[PDB]
Amino acid sequence: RVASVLGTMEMGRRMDAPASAAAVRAFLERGHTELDTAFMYSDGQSETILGGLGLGLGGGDCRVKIATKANPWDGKSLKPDSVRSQLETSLKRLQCPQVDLFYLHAPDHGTPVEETLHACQRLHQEGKFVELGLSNYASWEVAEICTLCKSNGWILPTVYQGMYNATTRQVETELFPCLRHFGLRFYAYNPLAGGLLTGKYKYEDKDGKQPVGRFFGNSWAETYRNRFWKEHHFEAIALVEKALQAAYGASAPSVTSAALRWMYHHSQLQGAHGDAVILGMSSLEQLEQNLAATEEGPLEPAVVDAFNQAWHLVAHECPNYFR
Amino acid sequence: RVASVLGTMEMGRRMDAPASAAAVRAFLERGHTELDTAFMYSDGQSETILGGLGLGLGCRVKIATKANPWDGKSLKPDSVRSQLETSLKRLQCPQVDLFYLHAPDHGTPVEETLHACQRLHQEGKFVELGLSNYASWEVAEICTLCKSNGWILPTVYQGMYNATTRQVETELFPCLRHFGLRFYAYNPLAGGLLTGKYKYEDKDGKQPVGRFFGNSWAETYRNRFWKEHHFEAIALVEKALQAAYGASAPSVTSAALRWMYHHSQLQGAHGDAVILGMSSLEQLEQNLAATEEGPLEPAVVDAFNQAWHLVAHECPNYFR
Ligand SMILES: NC(=O)C1=CN([C@@H]2O[C@H](COP(=O)(O)OP(=O)(O)OC[C@H]3O[C@@H](n4cnc5c(N)ncnc54)[C@H](OP(=O)(O)O)[C@@H]3O)[C@@H](O)[C@H]2O)C=CC1
Ligand SMILES: NC(=O)C1=CN([C@@H]2O[C@H](COP(=O)(O)OP(=O)(O)OC[C@H]3O[C@@H](n4cnc5c(N)ncnc54)[C@H](OP(=O)(O)O)[C@@H]3O)[C@@H](O)[C@H]2O)C=CC1
């Protein structure tokens, strides 16, 4: 019931075009339909790869849904010209006439939001995208946006893509109530905390080993460390690992499995609202493993309580869902 | 620089009219000017007492009141008007300086409520509009609706804020700054928990009569603040006060209030204020003295931060 969307951030980075195409195929073979990319992902290479799969995206002949995003970074603003330019470039790369979902990837605090939204309204009138989404906007910024659109008679956003996992729940307090009021569904990213919730790291890895991956050896590693790589977060993971052992003994699932099942079975995400989890991977084996976990059932209550105890351990230092 | 407002919730409850009048006098004698009451306080007795003090309220003294949605009164237009007009009669004044929506009415579209406030403002029944207990996102909706409709915007938000209760800092404070609302803090001592006068185990045996026991709102207040981790937090601050100042240490009450005036997100430059609470004149006088004390040693400010981190996972919601 809670849906799954395929994250394509690693396509064109760790995953070459063949690996990416196998990934999409595995995802589709499980009955899922929706793909998440962005103007910025692997410097345009993610969209380019997806556009070359012969899926016929944006066409009436297409069962696959595609989402992309414009961003304000590196001096591109979210001023009208920049929003148009990014979307049109995305359309060329994806080799499609319109995308199913277009996001504002993160806020442009230098550009009045009414300007940006007027550009989105116009681009929607032109048939460049079907639905509008927001990502990384505060609840109060979402409300302002929705209220402006209603009063101007513009397209409202209908999807919010936000940071959410078993140990990162800031979104629950104010954002989820706001979204319910304005009618936005929620797609969760960082569902394994960039990989921290696989249990494959030790806190001390940051001094010696520094294993190349999401948290080391790239341009966003330090952002990810600051987001999730905290001692209390490792204590939290250990707490959940111990609960899995105690509740299931020899038959215990992986912590990865458990962390994803939390999302689909025990989070505030509701299939009734059209909510979804955006799965991440840097390889096809990781993806296949994750897809298996999505088809697993609920967890023992003690493990759910453990995850809650885990969140309480880190809630004081939760990263902001907004930027 | 951070201002002080007098909370009048106890006027007509633990404080009779003479004690209340002496309280107002002590407050005004310190140079302060602003009083906070509400339609609901002591079943209308708070406003009535204030209205009988001959202060001429609609003038150096400023008065705020609030309409609420509770007990089946909605915040539908008729209810808003009816509450304000009754408050005006009780306060014996033609207009109030600040009128709040006390808490959200989730059964009534907010645009209805706001149109009523616009009309009542046009009539000169109140000068400024305030909000209390609305989420940051609800404040943003409201401000955006008022701008588009050409109506009076709210300019004051009255919210729950103290050294161990800081949920408002994350989203609400940024929102307020953007829309130009000043912030007035209530529960600055966590209803009295931050005086250090209680032990967690008081809930079992002693149950001392006061904010937390023996009355209709005690259970709400226990659910809000009466948590083991909160008492751990208080003890941590008391230990830091002993360490930092030794024999010269201030009271934890004095410290908690100085935090608000000197070390919180409240800014005098924005017109922000603390709403002082008391259930007696001695309490008030002790609290007023703390407002005139200076900043705290860094180590105590850090201890307060450590204390907040202890309780942040179970912080009560600032919105309703
Ligand atoms: N709107 C926004 O600001 C955001 C949008 N997104 C979108 O959401 C998608 C998902 O988020 P993402 O953060 O990638 O998801 P995750 O939290 O699941 O992190 C995924 C990473 O964790 C590791 N991992 C995943 N599965 C396994 C496994 N089974 N075993 C071992 N390691 C595993 C891999 O990292 P590694 O092997 O490198 O160590 C993978 O790259 C993205 O692809 C993107 O489309 C993502 C971030 C921000
Ligand atoms: N808009 C809203 O929803 C809210 C508005 N308010 C307003 O804010 C004002 C202040 O809030 P309030 O919670 O009262 O503020 P506090 O957090 O300071 O709580 C005040 C209570 O703490 C105790 N106390 C205060 N000073 C001392 C002292 N020096 N020594 C020992 N105990 C002390 C007394 O309780 P005890 O009975 O135990 O003696 C007093 O009644 C209220 O009067 C009201 O006007 C208040 C709450 C909600």
Structure tokens at A200: 């494959």
CA angle centred on A147, ends A144 and A150, rounded to 5° = 150
Residue type, B132: S
Contact B287, B299 (CB under 8 A): no
- What residues have CB less than 8 Å from A293, skipping those under 6 apart? A253, A254, A256, A257, A260, A261
CA A82 to chain centre: 23
Q: Cα A6 from chain centroid?
A: 9
Beta carbons of B283 and B254 less than 8 angstroms apart = no
| Of residues A299, A297, A295, the one with CA closest to residue A27 | A295
A41 is catalytic: yes
Report chain A residues whose CB lies below 8 A from the CB of B314: 312
Q: Give the number of beta-carbon pairs within 8 Å between A and B.
A: 65
Q: Which residues of A touch B (CB under 8 A)?
A: 138-144, 146-148, 151, 170, 173-174, 177-178, 311-313, 315-317, 320, 322
CA dihedral angle for residue B131, residue B134, residue B137, residue B140, rounded to 10 degrees: -10
CA distance B316 to A312: 14
Nearest to B303 by CA among B270, B265, B258, B267: B258
| Residue A171 tokens, joined | 């979104």
Burial class (CB in 10 A: 0-12, 13-18, 19+), A263: buried
DSSP notation for A16-52: -HHHHHHHHHHHHHTT--EEE--TTGGGGHHHHHHHT
Residue A136 CA, distance from chain mean position: 10
- Chain A residue numbers with beta carbons less than 8 Å from the beta carbon of B309 are 316-317
Residue of chain B whose alpha carbon sits nearest to that of A138: B171
Q: Which residues contact A319 (CB under 8 A, 6 or more apart)?
A: A163, A168, A170, A226, A227, A228
The answer to whether B296 touches B259, Cβ cutoff 8 Å, is: yes
- Pick from A139, A148, A316: CB nearest B144: A148
H helix intervals, B129-263: 136-149, 172-179, 218-225, 228-245, 252-263
Q: Do A177 and B148 touch (CB under 8 A)?
A: no
- A152 known ligand binder: no
Nearest to B136 among A140, A312, A317 (CB): A140
Resolution in Å, one decimal place: 2.4
Q: How many CA atoms lie within 13 A of A62 on its CB side?
A: 21
**Share of chain B residues as helix, strand and coil, in percent rounded to the nearest 5:** 50, 15, 35
Helix (H, G, I), strand (E, B) or coil at A320: coil
Interface contact A142-B139, CB threshold 8 A: no
- How far apart CA A186 and CA A271 sit, in angstroms, is 10
Give backbone dihedrals phi and psi of A144, rounded to 5 degrees, phi first.
-55, -50
CATH number assigned to the domain comprising residue B154: 3.20.20.100
Distance from the CA of B68 to the center of ligand 2, in angstroms? 19
**Which of A23, A6, A5 minimizes the C-alpha distance to A14?**
A23
Quote the number of domains for chain A.
Answer: 1
Specify the DSSP class assigned to residue A272.
G
B170 and A320 Cβ atoms separated by less than 8 Å: yes
Q: Collect all residues of chain A within an 8 Å Cβ-Cβ radius of residue B145.
A: 147, 151
The 8-class DSSP code of residue B11 comes to B
Residues in chain B: 320
Q: Using DSSP, state whether B29 is helix, strand or coil.
A: helix
* Longest CA pairwise span in chain A (Å): 60
3-state secondary structure (DSSP) of residue B70: coil
DSSP 8-state symbol, A126? T
- Rounded to whole angstroms, the Cα distance separating A249 from A257 reads 15
Determine the structural domain holding residue A21 and report its residue range: 1-323
How many CB atoms sit inside 10 A of residue B113's CB?
Answer: 22
Experimental method: X-ray
Contact partners, residue A310, CB within 8 Å, separation at least 6: A166, A167, A236, A237, A239, A240
Q: After what residue numbers is chain B broken, C–N > 2.5 angstroms?
A: 58
Instruction: Give Cα separations from B189 to B161, B228, B258, B284 (angstroms).
Output: 9, 17, 11, 12
